[PDB]
Amino acid sequence: KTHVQLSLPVLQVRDVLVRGFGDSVEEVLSEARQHLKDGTCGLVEVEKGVLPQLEQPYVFIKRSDAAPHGHVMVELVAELEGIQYGRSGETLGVLVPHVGEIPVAYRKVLLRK
């Protein structure tokens, strides 16, 4: 399927144990997609002071369209030293590995895969 319904656990930035997906734009997009498929991907909502507490390159989920079955359609955009790889809509948050942190909420998304 071109899209997959996922429910992403929303994590508090200070709880995150693994603060990024790797060391290059291509690696972080690769690893983010793998963790999204495996159910091992978390979401941190972006506010003041959040991104400096996480590791670059960043992987964002961004709104790709204006929401089937409650699932916002999203796609992946990476960022490294202020340059983004991909073009999309509003950020829903930054993706991180999930390794058992307790979430505060869930974010239903339809991931363009």
SS3 99: coil
Name the experiment that determined this structure. X-ray
CA 103 to chain centre: 14
Cβ atoms 62, 91 nearer than 8 A: yes
Angstrom resolution of this structure: 1.6
CATH number at residue 23: 2.30.30
Rounded (to 5) percent helix, strand, coil in the chain: 20, 40, 40
- How many whole angstroms separate alpha carbon 85 and alpha carbon 80? 8
Strands 72-80 and 58-63, bridge-based pairing: antiparallel
Q: Supply φ then ψ for residue 90, to 5 degrees.
A: -60, 140
What does the block give as tokens for 22?
Answer: 């790797």
- Write 73-80 long-range contacts (CB < 8 A, 24+): 73/3, 73/109, 73/110, 73/112, 74/109, 74/110, 74/111, 74/112, 75/111, 75/112, 76/29, 76/32, 76/33, 76/111, 78/25, 78/28, 78/29, 80/24, 80/25, 80/56
Domain span at 98: 3-112
Question: Could you give the number of structural domains in the chain?
Answer: 1
Cβ atoms 96, 44 nearer than 8 A: yes
